[PDB]
Amino acid sequence: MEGFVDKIDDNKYLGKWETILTDGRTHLPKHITFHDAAAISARWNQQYVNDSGPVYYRHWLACQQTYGAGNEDCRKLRWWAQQITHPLHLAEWDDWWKDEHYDLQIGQHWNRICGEEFEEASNLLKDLKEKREGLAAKFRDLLKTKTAEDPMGKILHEVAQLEEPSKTPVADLVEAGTLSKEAVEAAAALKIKELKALRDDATWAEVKGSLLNGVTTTCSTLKKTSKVVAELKAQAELERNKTSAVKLDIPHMRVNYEKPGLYEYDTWFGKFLPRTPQFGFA
Amino acid sequence: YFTRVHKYNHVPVPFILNVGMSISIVTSFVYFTYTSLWVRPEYDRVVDPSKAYVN
Numbered sequence: 447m448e449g450f451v452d453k454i455d456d457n458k459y460l461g462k463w464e465t466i467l468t469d470g471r472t473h474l475p476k477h478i479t480f481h482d483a484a485a486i487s488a489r490w491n492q493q494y495v496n497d498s499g500p501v502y503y504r505h506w507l508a509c510q511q512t513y514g515a516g517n518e519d520c521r522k523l524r525w526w527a528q529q530i531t532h533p534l535h536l537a538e539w540d541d542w543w544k545d546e547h548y549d550l551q552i553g554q555h556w557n558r559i560c561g562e563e564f565e566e567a568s569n570l571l572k573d574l575k576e577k578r579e580g581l582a583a584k585f586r587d588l589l590k591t592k593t594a595e596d597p598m599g600k601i602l603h604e605v606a607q608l609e610e611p612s613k614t615p616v617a618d619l620v621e622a623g624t625l626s627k628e629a630v631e632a633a634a635a636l637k638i639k640e641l642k643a644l645r646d647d648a649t650w651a652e653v654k655g656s657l658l659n660g661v662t663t664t665c666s667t668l669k670k671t672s673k674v675v676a677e678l679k680a681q682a683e684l685e686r687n688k689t690s691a692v693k694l695d696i697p698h699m700r701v702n703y704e705k706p707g708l709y710e711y712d713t714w715f716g717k718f719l720p721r722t723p724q725f726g727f728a
Numbered sequence: 729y730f731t732r733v734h735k736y737n738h739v740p741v742p743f744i745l746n747v748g749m750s751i752s753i754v755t756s757f758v759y760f761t762y763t764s765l766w767v768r769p770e771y772d773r774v775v776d777p778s779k780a781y782v783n
């Protein structure tokens with residue numbers, strides 16, 4: 447990963463490095479059993495596996511309705527649902543999901559709302575999404591045009607659109623005429639002055655004084671909300687075995703940096719994923 | 729007259745034939761059960777934790 451830049455979020459660049467890094471000659475594991483795969487294969491251990499796909503798809507639905515499809519836990523659940531669910535069921539359920547059938551507020555799946563009311567609400571929600579996405583696309587384009595103005599922005603933009611993922615991208619760019627030693631030196635000067643400012647005691651003290659309030663307020667809030675979250679968790683836990691139904695534990699599974707499983711190994715901790723709306727991409 | 733009751737028509741087995749048939753059947757069963765359930769070597773497992781690979 448010598449030449450891999452994590453800040454770059456170009457889909458093409460990430461795809462090139464997905465091809466480089468997840469190649470089977472070096473990434474395929476030999477004689478390895480993953481606990482996640484074993485557990486999923488032990489819960490539904492027969493050939494008839496029609497019952498796993500619905501459960502994992504609904505786990506992802508609840509997770510991404512509570513937190514949105516961009517959350518890393520939601521992405522993990524979506525990856526597993528795709529792995530273990532047959533594409534016929536996935537296609538049908540994705541068609542329903544695109545129609546706001548699984549929405550938590552006005553979706554008929556979770557609510558007893560009649561057809562006409564559901565229709566009008568879903569149309570309103572989809573139009574809202576369309577308008578917001580149009581505005582967001584315009585804003586993203588404008589921000590991307592402005593980013594290239596800055597020295598480092600220009601260098602990263604030129605690195606991203608390089609034809610092949612190289613081990614030494616900046617050297618290749620400066621040795622091919624695409625970038626200029628002068629621009630590289632200017633960017634390095636900007637970075638050096640920023641670094642010196644950060645480690646300067648006086649400027650760092652100024653920054654700390656400027657940012658102390660927000661951090662302190664956030665800490666106070668999320669230390670106060672901890673108790674109430676625990677009380678809610680216990681009260682819901684009283685519902686675990688109240689009836690024959692199964693209670694949800696949103697999120698079902700999270701990204702585990704301490705005990706990585708198959709998802710973390712295959713996607714490099716959620717970095718190389720399909721670039722479809724179900725994963726929170728445009 | 730019931731001519732098929734146990735008291736009629738008992739033919740003792742000659743000793744040589746008895747011995748031969750008994751030995752033959754015992755050997756057949758022993759050999760087949762041995763080669764079917766005890767000489768199964770394709771169920772071979774190699775315990776070696778140093779053949780795993782992780783990137």
Ligand SMILES: CCCCCCCCCCCC(=O)OC[C@H](COP(=O)([O-])O)OC(=O)CCCCCCCCCCC
Nearest residue numbers: 738739740741742745746747748749750751752753754756
């Ligand atoms: C067409 C038929 C094919 C199916 C095979 C059936 C073979 C049956 C042979 C039985 C002979 C017999 O009468 O058994 C009685 C004797 C004991 O002698 P006694 O008590 O009658 O004096 O007991 C013995 O002599 C011991 C021998 C029994 C071994 C079983 C037979 C082995 C042959 C297998 C052929 C495939």
